Structures are given as C-alpha cells and as structure tokens.
Ligand binder design. Structure first.
Ligand SMILES: Ic1ccc2[nH]ncc2c1
Ligand SMILES: Ic1ccc2[nH]ncc2c1
Lengths: 546, 546
C-alpha cells in the first residue's frame, strides 16, 4: 500500500532529458552518432561525470575534463570536432532551456495533498558557473512542494548505486512496497524495482501519469484547475518595524526584486494575500504583505485619530524609511485600496506604481459632508452602523468563528443583506448562529483569522471607518491633483458594495489608468478569484512596475 | 542660547541651487538674461510655481504651466525659444545633477551629536515624474540624519510666508533665539530673522560653516574624519525565520537590491555590522545582518552537534529558501568567515559571491586530526580552553560587562594574552576586574552585547568550536573542489590569531581570489576599521557581486 512518491528531476520533473539534447547537438553538428553521449558517460563509475555527480568536483572543474573526453571519443571515431565547439556553451544553453514539467509537478502536488510523502531524488552537480542562478531558481521553485530533496552531489552517492536507494528509504521512513519511484532512466529504475518498489519508466508524461494514477488509485490526469500556492504562516519570514513609540508594523516577506507592498482591507490580515504572495515572489518581486495598523501582529492603539488616512499614510512612509526602501509598488484591497490611492496622491515619489482591487478612486466632494455622501448610497449603511464606538465591536467580537464565516463568502452563498443594517440592529441579525463553510475557505483558514483577532479585536479595524470628516478635510487638499504614476483599477463584477460602476469616472483623475475586471467575483477578491487576481497583477507589474 | 539648527535643502544641503542652473541654461541657450528664472517665478504667490510648492498640483502638472510661462516671458522679451526646448529635460537633468553637500551634512551631524535638534525646512514639490526615484533616494539618505523634515508641499505653506516659520517653531518646541536658520535665499531668510532667529546666508559652504561654528561655539570645520553611520537597534526592521521546529533565525534588514547576508563571529551579534549595514544599503544592496545560531534573538539549542558546519550551512540554505532568495552574497568574519567559505564549497548555486574578514580558507588535512592541527599553533590554545563544556561558559558568563570590555579592544590596548590560556586557567586570569573602555566602543554598545548575551549565554556560541572532528570529516569531502565563484579575502595586519600569513596559500584553491588588507587593524575588524571595511566591501561588491 503506497504512501510515498519519488520523482527524478532530469526527464521527470524538468524537461527535457540530457541524453535527448546531447543527441540533438550531435545532429546539429553532423557529429558521429552517440559521440557526445559517449564522452559524457566516459569511464563510467570511475569517470569524470560520476565524480561530478558525487560532489567530488564542481561543474566548472568538470567542463575541461568533459572536453578532453570529447576529443578522445572523436580521435577513436576518426573524427574532428570544429574549432567553435564549446562544452560550456552547449551545457549553459541546455540547463537554461530546461523547464519544470508543470503536469508532473501537479501530480506530485495532488499526491502530497492526499497525504503522500513526496521526494525528489536526483543525480545532480555543484554548480559554480557564472549562470548558476538559473538552476538555483528552478530548484527553489520545485523543492518547496516536496518533503525531501535528495541530491547525489550532497550525499556523495549516485543512481544506480544501491546505497542511494537504501538512503532514500531511510529518509522516507518507508518500506519499499510503500514507494512509487518515477525515473526516465531504465538503468536507474532497476535498483528501486529490485527492492520491491513500484516503478514507472517515464517517457511521455501522460502515459507516466496514467500508470501513476492506476497504481495510486488517485485522479491525476484531467483534474480541475488547481488553486495557486498558498502560505503556511509558520514557514514565512516575519518582519517587524517600529514606526513610532507606540506603533509597530508586522509583515510577511517573500522573494527578491522590486518591493511590492500588499495592503489588506477590513476586517482582514496579511493572510488575505496568501494566494498572491508565492505567485508574485515567483514572478520576480519582493513581497511585503502587511498586517495593517489595528490588525494581527501590528499594534492596535485605541484612539480613533490613530486610524485617519493622514496618520496611516505617514506611518507607511516611515515603514519604507526604516526598511531603507526609496519606493514600493502599493497594492491594496477594500480599506487598503483607499490607503493606496492616498499614498499615490500624497507620496508619489515613494510609490513605484499603485493598484487597487474593488476600491475606486473618488475625489472628495468639498460641497457635501462625508456623512451626507455615505447616506446617499443605501449599500454604505453598514458604515453608519460602524460609527458608534462599541456597537459593532460587541457584535463582531461575540463569536469570532461566526463573524469570519458569515463575512467570508462567495457571491453565490451570502447570508448577509448589508441592507438597512442599522434598522435591523446588526450585520448578523438574520444570519445563522452556525454558518456553513464557504467554498472559498477551509476551517483551518477561518481559525487563523479567529486566532489573529483574539489579540486586539475589532476596535482599531472599525476605527478605519471612524475618520470620515478628518479624511475628507485632508483629501480636499489633493483636489487639484491628478494621479500620473502607473495605476491599475481592478473591479469585481459581483461586489455589491464596491460595484464596478463606482470606478467609471476614474480616468478624469488618472488619465493613463489601466484596468482589470473579474467576472463572477464577490468582495473577497483575493480568495474568491486567486488565479485571475494573480494573472492581472503579474501582467500589470511586468509591463508597468518594472 | 542655541539648541536647534535648521537647514534648507536647495543650495544648502544639496548642491547646486536652482537659480544658478536656470541661469546656466539661459547662457547655454543664448536666451535673454533672467528669462527662465523669470517664467519660473511668474505670478509670484498666485503663480503656478507657488501652487506646486504648496502641494496644490504635482510636478508633472506644473511642467506644461512652466512651459506656458516661458513662452509668454519670451513673447514680451521679443525672443523666440528654439523647437528643441524642453522644461522636462532641463528639470530632469538639474534634479539628477544635484547631490548632497557632504560637508554641510557633516556639520548638521556634529550639531545633533552635540545635542542640537536639527531639521530640514524646504520648499519642495510632489514628484510624479517617471524619474522621481532619484529624488526619493536623496531625501531618504538626507532625512534619516535629522529630527524633522518639513516639506512645503506637505504642510500647504511656503517660504517666505510667516506661518511656515511659526509652524517650524511649533515643531521644534523652541523659541526663535534658540534657532540657527541656514538658507541660500535672502528673501527666505528675513522672516526667520524678523522672529529673532540666528540666520546665516549661505553662499559658499566654508564661509557658512565658519559663521555656524562662531555662533554655536562648536567645531565643524577641519574636524577629524567622522565614523560611518551606525544602527539604532530599535529603529531597524527585525526579521524572524523558523528554519526547523526548534530553530528560528533572527536578522536585521535594510536596503534594496542584491541580498548581502552578513555573518558575525564569536562571541558577537548582528550589531557587530552596525557600521556596515547603512553604508551597504546606501551602496544599493539589501542587507540581512544575522544573529547566527546560538546568538541574540536567534535560537540557541544546547546540543553540541547543532553547531557543526554541515547543520549551520544547511540551515542558512533553508533561511534563503524560506525568504524566497535563490542567492545571496555571503560576507563573514571570524566563525562567520569560516561558514561563508563552506557555503561557497557546498552550496555555490546559492552563493552570489563570498567574502571573508580575517578568516582564511585552509583545506582540511586528511592526514592529521583537527585536534593535532590546533595544537601545532600556539595562538589557537584558547580553542582548547573552549573544548570542555561549562569551563569557558562559567568564566565568560561570570561578568558580561567585563567579558565584552576585555574582548573588544583595538590592537593598541589589549589586556588578553591569548597565550597559554589553559595553563593560566582562563582568558581573563591576568585581566582587570574593571577594564577600561576601548576607543572602539561606547559603554552603551557594550551594554547592548551584555543584554543580548543575558538570553542564552555562551553555550551555543562556544559549541561552534566543539565540532572540530565533525567539521573535519565533512570538509574532507570537498578536498577535490576549488572555489570558482567571485571571492574576497580581507586580512587584518594586527590580528594576532587570524594572522594575514595564514591566508597566503588561498590562491591554490581560489585561483581568481581578490584581496583587501587593513593596516593597524586588530581582530574586531568591523568596529576597528569601519571606514576601510566599508570602502573594501562596497568596491568589491560593485565590481564582482553585481
Ligand atoms: I465588511 C464588507 C464590506 C464590503 C462588502 N461587499 N460585499 C460584502 C461586504 C462586506
Ligand atoms: I575570542 C578571540 C578570537 C580571535 C582573536 N584575535 N585577537 C583577539 C581575539 C579574541
């Protein structure tokens, strides 16, 4: 009975296999058949390539030895290689051309999701080439999805030597009959079979996945489109910056490249961006996913004025100052989307680019009090319910699990009217005491939000809505400005509060505005449509954020 | 009696002044004298430039209005500007050419060091130009050194309006006679004088600094070369990554660009790099200054095996994995320098470049036990004293203040023999109970190390020396390798343990090795010679680390 799956790298998790490309080179070069593949394999266990794979020597040391094998193979062949022949060029090009076999990785992902222990077992080298980062990046992306990565050059043993298979078994804490072993090399597959392991010879991926599906009894082929990679909170780098004597800001950080500062809405967390963080880091960006002031591990002072846009924006500037960042791309959702527009208007020199999910940019009306403005729109009634200190805190804090379960739902499954909230006397007045679980979230994810909110509750978060007059007075100073830095407005078709139509006049104030639109998407954009959000943000970032 | 100093930005803290460059442009272009300076100043308080400086409009909105003023000034002048005339080009070029007036900043730094409250008061704009980052970076570098930064476009008032001076006074919490105000503009200087503030009209810096020195009674001109910027621990971004169930690694993070991972030695801290962190971040790098395992806020498990090089290196790889970093430049000192060479040998794909201060790279002798090797050199006797669990912990933990004060000393002032340590029965056996303070450190800095070491003591740190056999066996597997990635060896002339001569054969194993050498430098390289360390590292990083 299987509980472990082992995958080779070359020709299994990454395509294409070496022997094929060495073959391709022989042909492109009109060289005698198999000469390159032959010099590569020269001396077998005692040869230069085995020493490389065992970690005795580096890739740069192996290059001249492979060169010497090529000449000697050519000498016996009664052949002469040209004067433009480079092993370095051939190998640089081949390593660079090799990409993750996405459907193979998906099957490994599904197996692990079903409780399998997964591992990569590979005959690899110690790469010290000037271009080593390309391979480093590939191994980084691949390895995160597996329980174990066993590299021949690290353990000093190679396939097909029996000890590596015994090493693999000892690592897995499994007896061989509990293991599926996938390899594209028949010779490297035999020792695993000898031990009684289930083996799959990998030629074309589809056939290999059909065999894998049959042996495991788990659907791997033709499955629905998977969700993007999420975040395990305990596996993240957690950062903390004191922005002022009583205020510290917490954030989760992943990746390298231009800083992308993610600003959640109400009543959320850095964790609301769980589906965006790995994708954006994988796309070549340094992600800083904030716990906004009043939330999670960030400070939550009680004073209402601590949460006006002017103070919040000033603190975000100090946050960048303390981190040594002259700029960051600012991406916000809901209340975070509002902050992000104000960061663009007031601190454009610190904003590389600005993007908002659902939250439109609407200039302050200097001829109408913000309270009058909110009253004009029936859907903003919940904002009035939030005004009175203590009222919404008591309802929202009564049962945290009910709060997040009632709030976090797709457009298809709501239990909340958002209609005449004050008149009804609550957000959850006609809501079940034990709401069902939305298709959007797992119980574990609800529990994370529950645990986060146990620290400071809803006072600081609700305070974000309690500065309408102060925010209005400050926003009025920006009335003659326009947003001329790169900007993206992302609307959600089924957000019944932050309706797409509310963003319709944005081009009057952001003339070069770029747009994204998500169909059949509710208010909780990031978890509702993670794949689409990722696609829109990465595409916009690569074209406009540099 | 003075206690506050205020500096203008344009023509005071940054050079050169606008009126001069607008003048320069008129001349280069053969334009009627003062036309550009005139169109710039058009409409005075009611004009386009005042609105820009008050924050009513952005720089990109102001450009076409300045263009329209230029034409109208030319029309009256009976002049026609050419068809290649660009306000954007002129202003982009001028902003870019403007640099920090280093001697003015030094005087502001000295005044603040002497207890003055310092501030920058500037008539500036909201920059939304594609090239805004150049200015953002300059303001970031400048602002960190001051108590206050008052920007006209942020406060909605400009010099020479009296309210800005009253705003400045209210910010300073000072009466005008307590303030020196430096400005290059006579008109902007008068309101401050009217209030009774001490004023300095700034033309050439030297004369301005002579006047400043006279009025304050503090030496600002001809002073000794200052130390590089240090770190205030409470003002840093603190990061935490769990590398395994029982191990968490703490680090301080500053800057943007390629990741540079700083690895301290024994018995140190991330704080040992305090003089390097701001400089390296300012040089265009993302600094990650570690608390190595066993130190400060990082975990300190008791087991000896937790501190062998193999485990330490594996954890540093996981640290990069968890942060989403495919590579980092690794810079180490003492025990950190040793780890950094092993990172290069075992994980070259993860090492962008490698640099070591004092610690040479010496391949393991497979024919001699590491204990035999250590015994062969009299200076390594302290390492034998460190072998026995509990002995060195008791002496080093008896009085923390005495420990760091006795250890952290320049080559000129040592109290420690490091000679026949075991025979003497201790490191501090012939050392004063109340050591004097080294010229290298302040009492506050000693206290920081004291506080850090109160958490875990010396067990985990001393454990770094307790894996000689394990490290030797592992290092022997790398005997056929060479270091072919970019590498720097920095020797310290007066390090009497890690003597420069010990690094003499390094080129045999690192053929492309680059070098640095610091004269009159002891063991505590970073704090002994911070300016020289910074110069060597930045120069090497820019040429070899990208
Ligand atoms: I609180 C909150 C805010 C906006 C919303 N839009 N749709 C649901 C919903 C809940
Ligand atoms: I602990 C230690 C290690 C090396 C040294 N070199 N010079 C002083 C000194 C102290």
């Amino acid at each position: 009975t299987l509980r472990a799956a082992v995958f080779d790298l070359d020709g299994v998790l990454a395509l294409p296999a070496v022997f094929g490309v060495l073959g391709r080179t022989e042909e492109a070069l009109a060289l005698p058949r198999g000469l390159l593949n032959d010099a590569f394999q020269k001396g077998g266990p005692e040869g230069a390539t085995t020493r490389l794979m065992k970690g005795e020597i580096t890739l740069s040391q192996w290059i001249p030895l492979m060169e010497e094998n090529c000449r000697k193979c050519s000498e016996t062949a009664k052949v002469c290689l040209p004067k433009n022949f480079s092993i370095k060029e051939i190998f640089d090009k081949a390593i660079s051309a090799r990409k993750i076999n996405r459907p193979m990785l998906q099957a490994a992902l599904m197996l692990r999701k079903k409780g399998f222990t997964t591992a990569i077992l590979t005959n690899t080298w110690l790469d010290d080439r000037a271009e080593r980062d390309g391979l480093a990046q590939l191994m980084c992306e691949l390895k995160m999805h597996f329980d174990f990565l066993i590299e021949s050059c690290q353990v000093g043993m190679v396939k097909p030597e029996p000890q590596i298979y015994k090493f693999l078994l000892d690592t897995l804490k499994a007896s061989p009959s509990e293991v599926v072993f996938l390899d594209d090399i028949g010779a490297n597959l035999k020792p695993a079979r000898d031990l009684g392991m289930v083996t799959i010879l990998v030629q074309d991926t589809d056939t290999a996945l059909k065999e894998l599906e049959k042996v495991t009894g788990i659907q791997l082929l033709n499955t629905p489109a998977p969700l993007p990679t999420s975040c395990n909170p305990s596996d993240m780098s957690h950062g903390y910056v004191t922005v002022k004597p009583r205020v510290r800001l917490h954030f989760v950080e992943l990746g390298s490249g231009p800083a992308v500062c993610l600003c959640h809405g109400f009543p959320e967390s850095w964790y609301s961006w769980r589906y965006q963080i790995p994708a954006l880091a994988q796309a070549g960006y340094r992600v800083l996913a904030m716990d906004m002031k009043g939330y999670g591990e960030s400070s939550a002072p009680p004073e209402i004025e601590e949460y006006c846009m002017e103070v919040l924006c000033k603190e975000m500037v100090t946050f960048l100052d303390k981190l040594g960042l002259s700029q960051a791309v600012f991406i916000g959702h809901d209340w975070g989307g509002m902050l992000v527009w104000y960061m663009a208007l007031f601190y454009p020199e610190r904003v590389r680019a600005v993007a908002s999910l659902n939250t439109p940019f609407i200039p302050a009306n200097p001829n109408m009090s913000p309270l009058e403005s909110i009253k004009a729109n029936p859907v903003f009634d919940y904002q009035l319910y939030f005004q009175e200190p203590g009222v919404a805190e008591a309802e929202l804090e009564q049962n945290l699990s009910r709060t997040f379960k009632s709030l976090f739902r797709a457009s298809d499954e709501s239990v909340l009217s958002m209609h005449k909230v004050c008149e009804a006397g609550g957000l959850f007045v006609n809501s079940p005491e034990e709401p069902s679980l939305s298709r959007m979230v797992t119980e574990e994810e609800i529990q994370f939000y529950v645990q986060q909110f146990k620290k400071s509750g809803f006072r600081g978060p609700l305070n974000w809505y309690r500065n309408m007059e102060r925010n209005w007075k400050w926003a009025c100073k920006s009335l003659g400005r326009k947003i001329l830095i790169p900007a993206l407005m992302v609307t959600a078709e089924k957000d019944f509060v932050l309706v797409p139509q509310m963003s319709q006049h944005m081009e009057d104030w952001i003339p070069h505005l770029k747009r994204g639109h998500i169909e059949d998407c509710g208010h909780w954009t990031q978890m509702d449509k993670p794949t689409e959000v990722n696609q829109i943000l990465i595409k916009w970032l690569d074209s406009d954020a540099r």
